[PDB]
Amino acid sequence: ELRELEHTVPQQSKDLETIKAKLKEDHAVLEPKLDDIVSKISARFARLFNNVGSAGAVRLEKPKDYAEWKIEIMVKFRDNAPLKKLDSHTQSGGERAVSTVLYMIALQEFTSAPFRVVDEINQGMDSRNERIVHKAMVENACAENTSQYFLITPKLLTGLHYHEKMRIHC
Amino acid sequence: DLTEDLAVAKIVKENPVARKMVRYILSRGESQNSIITRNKLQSVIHEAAREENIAKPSFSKMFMDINAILYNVYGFELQGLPSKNNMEPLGHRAQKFILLNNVPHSKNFDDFKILQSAHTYEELIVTGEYIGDDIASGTSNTLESKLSTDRDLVYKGVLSVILCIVFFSKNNILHQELIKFLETFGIPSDGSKIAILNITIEDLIKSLEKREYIVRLEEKSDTDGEVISYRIGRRTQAELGLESLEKLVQEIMGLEKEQTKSLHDDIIKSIGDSYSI
Amino acid sequence: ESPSGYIKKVILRNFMCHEHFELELGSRLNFIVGNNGSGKSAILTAITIGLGAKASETNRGSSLKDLIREGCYSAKIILHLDNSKYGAYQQGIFGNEIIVERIIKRDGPASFSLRSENGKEISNKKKDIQTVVDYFSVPVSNPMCFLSQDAARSFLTASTSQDKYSHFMKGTLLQEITENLLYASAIHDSAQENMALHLENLKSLKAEYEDAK
Amino acid sequence: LINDYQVSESVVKTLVAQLNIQLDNLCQFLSQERVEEFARLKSVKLLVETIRSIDASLLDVLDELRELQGNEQSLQKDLDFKKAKIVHLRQESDKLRKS
Amino acid sequence: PDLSSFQPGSIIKIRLQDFVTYTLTEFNLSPSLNMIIGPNGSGKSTFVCAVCLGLAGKPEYIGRSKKVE
Amino acid sequence: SKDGDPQLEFKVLQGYRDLESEMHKGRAQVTRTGDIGVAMDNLNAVDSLFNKVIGIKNNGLFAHDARAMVSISELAQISVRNLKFDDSRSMVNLENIVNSLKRYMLKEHFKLNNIAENRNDTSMRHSYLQQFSHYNEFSQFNWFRIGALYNTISKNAPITDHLMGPLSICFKKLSKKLGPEGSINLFKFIIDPNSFSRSIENLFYTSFLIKEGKLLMEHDEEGLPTIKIKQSISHTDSRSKEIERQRRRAAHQNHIIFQMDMPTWRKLIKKYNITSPFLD
Amino acid sequence: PVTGDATAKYLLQYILSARGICHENALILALMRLETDASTLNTEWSIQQWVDKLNDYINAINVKLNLLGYKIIRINHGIGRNAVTLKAKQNFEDYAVLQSIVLPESNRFFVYVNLASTEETKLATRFNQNEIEFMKWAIEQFMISGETIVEGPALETSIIVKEVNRILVAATGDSNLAKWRKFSTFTVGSTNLFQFQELTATDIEDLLLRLCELKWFYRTQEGKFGIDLRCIAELEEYLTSMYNLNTCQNCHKLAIQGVRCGNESCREENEETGENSLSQIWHVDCFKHYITHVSKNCDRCGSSLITEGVYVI
Amino acid sequence: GTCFDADMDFRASLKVRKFSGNLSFIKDTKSLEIYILTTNDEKARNVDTLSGGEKSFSQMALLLATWKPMRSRIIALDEFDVFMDQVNRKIGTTLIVKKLKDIARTQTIIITPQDIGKIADIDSSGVSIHRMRDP
C-alpha cells in the first residue's frame, strides 16, 4: 500500500505546487487594483476632511489570510481625544452619522450610479456640519460631468453659502 | 590628555577632508544604524578630493587617522567586516565597515540605566496603554529619559531575543520554528500590525535580513518544498564578543556570580558553529 | 406574593445624568417616562454599577473617569432593597431593608459601603456584596440581565432565520457554554497529541527500562 | 410600457440592475434607519458592500481566492498527514529490519 | 441637452399623478445638483417613497408602508 | 417549586467562586512541588459537584468548569515538559532557556496586580520556571528590559540621532444688494407670467422663520409665513452656532397643514407690481 | 587618557544616548558614578566644585567638538526654578551612591548641535525629501502662529500659569490683576497640522507621534503640539535670520516661554507684526530675576506691574 | 428543555393575539425557522412573508421566550427602538404589561421615552409609572 502511495504522491505534489503558484500569481495580480482603490479612497478621505476641517484616516488591513481582509475607519473628531475606531463607545450617534454620510459622498465618483439619495441627517444635530458638507459637495461639483446628488434636510438655516447651480424646489 | 588631544588637532588641521569624511561616516552610521561598503567609501572620498582639489592620499594611513579621530573625540572605531567567502581582520582590505567603540564596559551604569528604564516602563504602559496622544499629559517622556526612541528599543529587544533563539538553535533555525516561537511569546503572525512595533512579522524579518543581522539560506527539493534557514551575520559576530555574550547569558539566567565558571563551555557548545574564529 | 430583593427607592448622588435623583419603584413593574441626550439611561448605569456589573459589559463608558460627574470628585450611588417578604437574607441583623452603597472617586479604586436598615456599616469587602446580590438570583455577569439601547436596537433588526438563530445561540449563557465545549474539545485534541508525544518518550524510557529490570 | 411590449416586475428589476442602480445597494440609497445600520456594520461586510458598489469581478475573484485558500489549507492538512506517513515509513523500515 | 452630462441611469423628468398627496408633481432635475430642503412632514417622506417605488422595490425594505395599496 | 431550590444554586455558585480562587492561588504551589494530586482532588471535587448538579440545569458553572479543566490541562502539559528529563541530571533544554529568558515579572504581577509571588518551594533548580507560562497575550512580558539592555552593555552600539541637517538649509448677494431694511414678501418670487412651473420655488424655503430665532414675528391671521431681512451671526466654531441654534429653537413653532394650488393667484401681482423674477 | 579622556568619552556617550538633551541633575549623578568608579571615593566634596568640574569637562570636550564641527550649547529653561524638577519623581533612583544627592538650582540643559549651515555631507537622517518639506511647513506654521490678535478669558491652567502666579505672589502678593484676558500662545496647530495635500493621514499622524517621542516636539496636558527645547537649541540663527525673533537682555537667548506684554508701546515697525518683535522679552527666570532686583519698573518707556503678568504659552 | 420552554412561552404569548405558532431548532445549518399564523390563512408561515408589525411582534416574543428561563429578580430595559409602527408598538406594550404584571417573582424596570401613563390605564394592578423633570 505504501508503494501504491508512492505511485499516488507525484500528481498530488505537482497539484500542490501548481495551486501554490496560482495562489501567489493571483495575489500578485490582485494587489495593484486594491492598492490603487484604497489609495484613491484615502486621498478622497483626506481631501474631504481638509474641506470640513476635522481629522480622520482610513487604512486597509492585509492579514496573511485573505478571508479576514478588513478595512478600518480611524476618525479623530475631538482634539483632546486621540485616534479612535468608528464605534458607538467613543463617539455619539451624530459623529457616526457624519462619518457615514462623508463615506457615502466619498464613494460617489467611483460608483457608476448617477444619483445619490440620502435623507434624515439633521435629526438632533448641528446644521453647521451639514452646511459644510453641502458646500464641500458644491465646491466639488463645479467641474463638468459630475455625479448627481440628492440632498434632503429635515431642517433649514439662513445665512449660508449658495451657488449658481442650486435651485429651490418643493 | 592635552598631549593626545593636541596631536589630533594637528592631523585634523592638515586636511579638512578628513573631518568631512569622518563626519559623513558618523552621520551615515548613526542616522539609521546602517552599514557602509567600500565602493561607497572610495566614491565619497573621490568626490571630496575633487571638491577640495587635493590629491587622494593613501588608504591605510587615512583609515588609521579616521580611527584615531573617532577614538579620541567620540571613542568609536570603524571596524571592517571580514569576507564571507574567505572565512586576521581586514582593516584596510575588507569591503564592509561599521563603526563601533572598543571601550571596556562598566559594571554599574548598566544597572542604573536599566533601573531607570524600569521606573519609566512602570508608567509607560499602565493598563495596556502607550504614551503620546493617548496619554493626557504632554510630557510623556518626562523631558528626561535614557530611551530616546520609545520605538526602536523594543525593536532591539526583539532583535536580541531572536539572536538568542537562533544561538540556542544550533545556528540553524526553521521558519516555522521561529514562527511558533513568536506565537508562544505573544507576537501574532496572522498579519495584524503590532501595537508597539507598527509593523508585521514578515516585514520585520525581511528588514532584519536586509539589515544583514541575519542571513537566510534557501534550499530546493521535492519533499521539503521551500525550506528556509537563518544564520548569524558577521556584523553580530563583530559586535557581540565572547565576554559580551557571557554577560548577556549571566544576566538572563539571573544567578549568582560564583556559578559563572564551567558555563562558558556550555555556551560555546550551545551556540554551535557561529564564529569563524 | 412577591419575593424580597426587589428595588424600592433609587437615588443618584453626583452623577452625569442626574447629580440629585430621587424616585420610587414598585415591586411588580416600573415605568419611567423621560428623555435623555446621552445614549445611556438615567438609572440603568447606576444600578448596574451598584449591583456589581462592570462597565465593560455595559459598554456605556470607556473608562471609569468619564462616569464621574464633572465638577465633583466622587460619585455616590445608593441602593435600597426590601427584605420584609419571603426570601430574606438575614432579616434579623440586616433589618427589613439592606442598603448597599458604592462610591466612585477620581483617584484610587472605587469605594463601597454595606449599610443596614439603621444605616450602620457592617463590612467593606467585595465578597460580601457579591454574595448578597447573588443570593437573590441576580446575575450581573449576563449582559442580557439588563437590556441596553444598543443590544435592543441590534436585536430588533434581526428578523431573519440565520440572525435569529445566532441571537438565540448568543443568549444568556448558550454562546458561553458552546464556546466552552468547543474549546474543551480543542484542548482535548492538544492534550491527546501531547500525551502521544509523552507516550513516545515513555516507549523510549521503556526500551531503556529493559536495562533496569 | 417598454418598447411597446408589456413586461412584469422581474423585467423592471433586471433593467434597473443593468443600469448599475439598485435599492438593496447601500451606496446608492440611504435613510435614517439605513444610515444607523451602516454605522454599526462590521468591516468585512463593509468591504463586501464596497466591492459590490465598485465591481462584481472583485466579488468573483475574492470568492475564488477564498475557496482556493480553503483548498490549500486542506492540502496543508494533507501534507501534515503525508509527513506522518513519512514517520510511518521510518517505522516500516524498522519493521523491515524486523522482517 | 448633452450626452456626457447625463450619466447612465439618470432620470430627467418627474411625473407623479394620483399617487402622492399633491397628486400633481412635475419636478425639474438638473445634472449639476438637486436638493430638497424643507421642514419635516412637508412631503419629503412621500417623495422618497414615490421615487423608490418607481424602481418597483420591496415596500417592506423602507419600512414606511406594508403594502403598495 | 422544589426542583431547583435557590439554596442549591447559591451553594454551588459559592463553591465554584472560591474553588477558582483556590486554584488560581495554588497553581504556583502545584508547579513548584510538582505534585499534581492537588489537580486530581480538584477534578474529583468538580465531578462530585457536577453529580450533585445532575437533575437541575445550571449553565453558570459550565464556564468555570471549562476554565478549571483548561488550566489543569495546560499546567500538566507544561510541567511534564518542564520537568527534569533525568532523575538527577537536570537537562537545561531550550524550554528552560526560554523560561529563564521570560522570567521578568516586574510589572505584570508586581505592579499590575500588586501581588508578590513566593520564591520558596543543581537538580532542584527546575521548579521555578513552570509558573511563568500563562501569558496568553504579548503585553505582559517586560520586553523593555531586554530592549534597554541592548546597545548599552551587550552590543554597546552608539545610538545617536543626527541633528536637523536637511531642515537647516445667489440669494445672499441679492439680499445684500437689496438692502437689510428692505422687506420683500414671500409671494413675490412665485408670480411669473407665461410660465406655470415656477410657483414651486419659494414656498419650500421660507416655510417658517420663527425657528431661525431672529425676532418675535407676528402670527398672520391668514396663515402665510413672514420674513424680514435681519443680521445673522456667523462664526467658525461649530458649537458656538449650535448652542445658539438650539436656544433659538426653544421658541414655539406653529404646525399648520395648510396647502393649496394658489387659488386666485392673480391677486398677488395686483399689489406686488412686479413682472420679472427676482432670482437670476 | 585612563581617567580623563575615559570620563569625557563616557559623558559624551551618555549625553548622545539621550538625543543630546539631558538634565543637569542626570549629568551630575552620572559624573558621581564615574568618580565613584575611580580609584578612591570622594566624600568630602560639595556640589559647587562638582558642578564646576562638570562644566570644565563640558568645556574641554566642547572645544574638541568645535575643532571637529559640533558643539555642546548650554541654555536655560522656560519653566521656573522650582517647577522644572517638581514634574514627577525628581529622583527615580533610593539606592543613592552618595550619602546625599540634592540640588536646589537645576535649570540649565545641554543639547547636541553643530555650527555648519550647508552640511553637504548629510542628505537624509531618517526621512526623505517629502517629509523634510512637511516638517519645514510645520515649523513655518508654528512660527507664523506665534502671535495672536485676540484671546479669551478662559485662563487655561496646565503648567506655566500656576508657576508664574506663584512667582508673582512670592514677589508681591496681591492676586488682583494677575488673571489677564490676553495671552500669547506659540503652541498652535494641534488639529490644524492635519491639513495636508499630497500625503495621507495615518503616515503623517504616526510620524508626528514618532517625532514627539523622538524628543523633537512636546505637548501639554490638553494636547497642544509645540516646539521643544531641542529645536530651539539647534536652530539658533535659523529662527532669527528667516524671521526676526527677539532675544532677552543676555547675549542671545531665544525666548518661546516667559513674559510678553507689548500693550501699545511696541518696537520699531520694520515688519507688520508687533508685540515687542525687536526687544523687551523676558523668560520666567529672567522675569523673576528682574522683579527680585533693582528697577522693578519695566524698561519699555514705563510699564507698571498691574498691566504686566501676561502668560506666554 | 430550553427549546421546549421557549416554544411554550411563544405559544402562550401568541395566544393573546389569537394566533398560533411553534419553533423549529436545528443544529445542522444553524438556522431557526418560525411559523406564524396570520389572521385568515389557516396555515402558519415564515416571518419573512409577514408585515413589519408582525415581525416586531415575533421578535418581542422570541426575546421573551429567551429571557423566560432565567430567574433574575431585577432586570432593566431602556431606549427601545421605534422601527415598528405606533399601532403595533401600542399592542406590544400592552402585551408586555399583561405578561409582566401577572407574575410577581420577577421585577422589571422599563424605561420608555414616550408617554405610557396617558395611553395605558392606571387602575390595572401591578403597574407603577413615574416621571421626572424635563431638562
Coordinates of N, CA and C in Angstrom, one line a residue, chain C residues 1-7 18 21 23-36 39-44 47 136-139 142 144-149 152-153 155-156 158-162 164-165 168-169 171-172, chain H residues 6 25-27 30-34 47-48 55 59-60 62-63 66 70-79 81 83-84 97 100-102 104-116 126-132 134-135:
Chain C
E1 N -48.1 37.1 46.1 CA -46.9 37.3 46.9 C -45.7 37.5 46.0
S2 N -44.8 38.4 46.4 CA -43.6 38.8 45.7 C -42.4 38.6 46.5
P3 N -41.3 37.9 46.0 CA -40.1 37.7 46.8 C -39.4 39.0 47.1
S4 N -38.5 38.9 48.1 CA -37.7 40.0 48.5 C -36.6 40.3 47.5
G5 N -35.8 41.3 47.8 CA -34.7 41.7 47.0 C -35.0 42.6 45.9
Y6 N -36.2 43.1 45.7 CA -36.6 44.0 44.7 C -36.3 45.4 45.1
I7 N -36.1 46.3 44.0 CA -35.7 47.7 44.3 C -37.0 48.4 44.7
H18 N -28.0 62.7 36.4 CA -28.7 63.4 37.4 C -27.9 63.4 38.7
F21 N -30.9 62.8 42.3 CA -32.0 62.0 41.8 C -32.8 61.3 42.9
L23 N -36.4 58.7 43.3 CA -37.6 58.1 42.7 C -37.9 56.8 43.5
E24 N -39.2 56.4 43.4 CA -39.7 55.2 44.0 C -40.1 54.2 42.9
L25 N -39.7 52.9 43.1 CA -40.0 51.9 42.1 C -40.8 50.8 42.8
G26 N -41.9 50.3 42.1 CA -42.7 49.3 42.6 C -42.1 47.9 42.5
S27 N -42.8 46.9 43.1 CA -42.3 45.5 43.2 C -42.8 44.8 41.9
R28 N -43.9 45.1 41.3 CA -44.4 44.4 40.2 C -43.8 44.9 38.9
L29 N -44.0 46.2 38.6 CA -43.5 46.8 37.4 C -43.0 48.2 37.7
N30 N -42.1 48.7 36.8 CA -41.5 50.0 37.0 C -41.5 50.7 35.6
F31 N -42.1 51.8 35.5 CA -42.2 52.5 34.2 C -41.6 53.9 34.4
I32 N -40.7 54.3 33.5 CA -40.0 55.6 33.5 C -40.2 56.3 32.2
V33 N -40.8 57.5 32.3 CA -41.0 58.3 31.1 C -40.2 59.6 31.2
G34 N -39.3 59.8 30.1 CA -38.4 60.9 30.1 C -37.5 60.8 28.9
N35 N -36.7 61.9 28.7 CA -35.8 62.0 27.6 C -34.4 62.2 28.1
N36 N -33.4 61.7 27.4 CA -32.0 61.8 27.8 C -31.2 62.1 26.5
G39 N -26.9 58.3 25.2 CA -27.5 57.0 25.0 C -27.8 56.2 26.2
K40 N -27.0 56.4 27.3 CA -27.2 55.7 28.5 C -28.5 56.2 29.2
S41 N -29.1 55.3 30.0 CA -30.3 55.6 30.8 C -29.9 56.5 32.0
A42 N -30.9 56.8 32.8 CA -30.7 57.6 34.0 C -30.5 56.8 35.2
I43 N -31.1 55.6 35.3 CA -30.9 54.7 36.5 C -30.3 53.4 36.1
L44 N -30.1 53.0 34.8 CA -29.6 51.7 34.5 C -28.1 51.6 34.8
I47 N -27.6 51.5 38.6 CA -28.0 50.2 39.1 C -27.0 49.1 38.8
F136 N -30.1 36.6 45.8 CA -31.4 36.8 45.3 C -31.5 36.4 43.8
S137 N -30.6 35.6 43.3 CA -30.6 35.1 41.9 C -30.6 36.2 40.9
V138 N -29.7 37.2 41.2 CA -29.5 38.3 40.4 C -28.1 38.2 39.7
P139 N -28.0 37.7 38.5 CA -26.7 37.6 37.9 C -26.2 38.9 37.2
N142 N -24.3 38.5 33.2 CA -25.0 38.3 32.0 C -25.5 39.6 31.4
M144 N -27.6 40.2 29.1 CA -29.0 40.2 28.8 C -29.8 40.4 30.1
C145 N -29.2 40.4 31.3 CA -29.9 40.7 32.5 C -30.4 42.1 32.5
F146 N -29.7 43.0 31.9 CA -30.0 44.4 31.7 C -29.9 44.8 30.3
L147 N -31.1 45.1 29.7 CA -31.2 45.3 28.2 C -30.8 46.8 28.0
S148 N -29.7 47.0 27.2 CA -29.3 48.4 26.8 C -29.9 48.8 25.5
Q149 N -29.6 50.0 25.1 CA -30.2 50.5 23.9 C -29.5 49.9 22.6
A152 N -30.7 46.2 22.2 CA -32.0 46.2 21.8 C -32.2 46.6 20.3
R153 N -31.5 47.7 19.9 CA -31.6 48.1 18.6 C -30.9 47.2 17.6
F155 N -30.9 43.7 18.2 CA -31.6 42.5 18.2 C -33.0 42.7 17.5
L156 N -33.6 43.9 17.6 CA -34.9 44.1 17.0 C -34.8 44.1 15.4
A158 N -33.1 42.0 13.7 CA -32.5 40.7 13.4 C -33.6 39.7 13.0
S159 N -34.6 40.1 12.3 CA -35.8 39.3 12.0 C -35.6 38.5 10.7
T160 N -34.6 37.7 10.8 CA -34.3 36.7 9.7 C -33.8 35.4 10.4
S161 N -33.9 34.3 9.6 CA -33.6 33.0 10.2 C -32.2 32.9 10.8
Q162 N -31.2 33.2 10.0 CA -29.8 33.0 10.4 C -29.5 33.9 11.6
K164 N -31.6 35.4 13.7 CA -32.4 34.9 14.9 C -31.7 33.7 15.5
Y165 N -31.3 32.8 14.8 CA -30.6 31.6 15.3 C -29.3 32.0 16.0
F168 N -30.3 33.7 19.3 CA -30.7 32.7 20.3 C -29.5 31.9 20.8
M169 N -28.6 31.5 20.0 CA -27.3 30.9 20.5 C -26.5 31.8 21.3
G171 N -27.6 33.8 23.6 CA -28.4 34.1 24.7 C -27.7 34.3 26.0
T172 N -28.4 34.0 27.2 CA -27.8 34.3 28.5 C -26.4 33.6 28.6
Chain H
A6 N -39.1 27.7 25.5 CA -39.2 28.8 24.6 C -40.5 28.6 23.7
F25 N -35.8 24.2 16.0 CA -34.4 24.4 16.2 C -33.6 23.3 15.6
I26 N -32.7 23.6 14.7 CA -31.9 22.6 14.1 C -30.4 23.1 14.1
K27 N -29.5 22.2 14.4 CA -28.1 22.5 14.5 C -27.3 22.1 13.3
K30 N -27.5 25.7 11.4 CA -27.5 26.8 12.3 C -28.6 27.9 11.8
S31 N -29.8 27.4 11.6 CA -30.9 28.3 11.2 C -32.1 28.0 12.0
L32 N -32.9 29.1 12.3 CA -34.1 29.0 13.1 C -35.3 29.4 12.3
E33 N -36.2 28.5 12.1 CA -37.4 28.7 11.3 C -38.6 28.9 12.3
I34 N -39.3 30.0 12.1 CA -40.5 30.3 12.9 C -41.7 30.3 12.0
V47 N -41.9 34.2 9.1 CA -41.9 35.6 9.4 C -41.4 36.5 8.3
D48 N -40.7 35.9 7.4 CA -40.2 36.7 6.3 C -41.3 37.2 5.4
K55 N -43.5 41.2 12.3 CA -42.1 40.8 12.5 C -41.6 41.3 13.9
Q59 N -40.3 39.1 17.0 CA -39.1 39.4 17.7 C -39.2 39.6 19.2
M60 N -40.3 40.3 19.6 CA -40.5 40.5 21.0 C -40.9 39.2 21.7
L62 N -39.9 36.2 20.7 CA -38.6 35.4 20.8 C -37.8 35.9 22.0
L63 N -37.7 37.3 22.1 CA -36.9 37.8 23.3 C -37.5 37.4 24.6
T66 N -36.7 33.7 25.2 CA -35.3 33.5 25.5 C -35.0 34.0 26.9
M70 N -34.6 32.4 32.6 CA -33.9 33.0 33.6 C -34.7 33.4 34.8
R71 N -34.2 33.3 36.0 CA -34.9 33.6 37.3 C -34.4 34.9 37.9
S72 N -33.9 35.8 37.1 CA -33.4 37.1 37.6 C -34.5 37.9 38.2
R73 N -34.3 38.4 39.4 CA -35.3 39.1 40.1 C -35.5 40.5 39.6
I74 N -34.4 41.2 39.2 CA -34.5 42.6 38.7 C -33.8 42.7 37.4
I75 N -34.5 43.2 36.4 CA -34.0 43.4 35.1 C -34.3 44.9 34.7
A76 N -33.8 45.3 33.5 CA -34.0 46.7 33.1 C -34.0 46.7 31.5
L77 N -34.7 47.7 31.0 CA -34.8 47.9 29.6 C -35.0 49.4 29.3
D78 N -34.1 50.0 28.5 CA -34.1 51.4 28.3 C -33.9 51.7 26.8
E79 N -34.6 52.7 26.3 CA -34.5 53.3 25.0 C -34.7 52.2 23.9
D81 N -36.1 50.6 20.5 CA -36.1 51.1 19.2 C -37.5 51.3 18.7
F83 N -38.6 51.3 15.4 CA -38.7 50.9 14.0 C -40.1 50.4 13.7
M84 N -40.8 49.9 14.7 CA -42.2 49.4 14.5 C -43.2 50.5 14.4
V97 N -47.1 44.5 29.3 CA -47.6 44.9 30.6 C -48.4 43.7 31.1
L100 N -46.0 40.9 32.2 CA -45.1 41.2 33.3 C -45.8 41.6 34.6
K101 N -47.1 41.9 34.5 CA -47.9 42.2 35.8 C -48.5 40.9 36.4
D102 N -48.6 39.8 35.6 CA -49.2 38.6 36.2 C -48.3 37.9 37.1
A104 N -45.3 37.7 39.8 CA -44.7 38.6 40.8 C -43.3 38.1 41.2
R105 N -42.8 37.0 40.7 CA -41.4 36.5 41.0 C -40.3 37.3 40.3
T106 N -40.7 38.2 39.4 CA -39.7 39.0 38.7 C -40.1 40.4 38.6
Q107 N -39.2 41.3 38.9 CA -39.4 42.8 38.9 C -38.7 43.4 37.7
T108 N -39.4 44.2 36.9 CA -38.9 44.8 35.7 C -38.8 46.3 35.9
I109 N -37.8 47.0 35.3 CA -37.6 48.4 35.3 C -37.6 48.8 33.9
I110 N -38.7 49.3 33.4 CA -38.9 49.7 32.0 C -38.7 51.2 31.8
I111 N -37.9 51.6 30.9 CA -37.6 53.0 30.6 C -38.0 53.3 29.2
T112 N -39.1 54.1 29.1 CA -39.7 54.4 27.7 C -39.6 55.9 27.5
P113 N -39.1 56.3 26.4 CA -39.0 57.8 26.1 C -40.4 58.4 25.9
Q114 N -41.3 57.6 25.3 CA -42.7 58.1 25.1 C -43.5 58.0 26.3
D115 N -44.8 58.5 26.3 CA -45.7 58.5 27.4 C -46.5 57.2 27.4
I116 N -46.6 56.6 28.6 CA -47.3 55.4 28.7 C -48.5 55.6 29.7
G126 N -50.5 46.3 39.6 CA -49.1 45.9 39.2 C -48.4 46.8 38.2
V127 N -48.9 48.0 38.0 CA -48.3 48.9 37.1 C -48.0 50.2 37.8
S128 N -46.7 50.6 37.9 CA -46.3 51.8 38.5 C -45.5 52.6 37.5
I129 N -46.0 53.8 37.2 CA -45.4 54.7 36.3 C -44.9 56.0 37.0
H130 N -43.7 56.4 36.7 CA -43.1 57.6 37.3 C -42.4 58.4 36.3
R131 N -42.4 59.8 36.5 CA -41.8 60.7 35.6 C -40.9 61.7 36.4
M132 N -39.9 62.3 35.7 CA -39.0 63.3 36.2 C -39.2 64.6 35.6
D134 N -38.5 67.5 33.1 CA -37.9 67.6 31.7 C -36.8 68.6 31.6
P135 N -35.6 68.3 31.2 CA -34.5 69.2 31.1 C -34.6 70.2 30.0

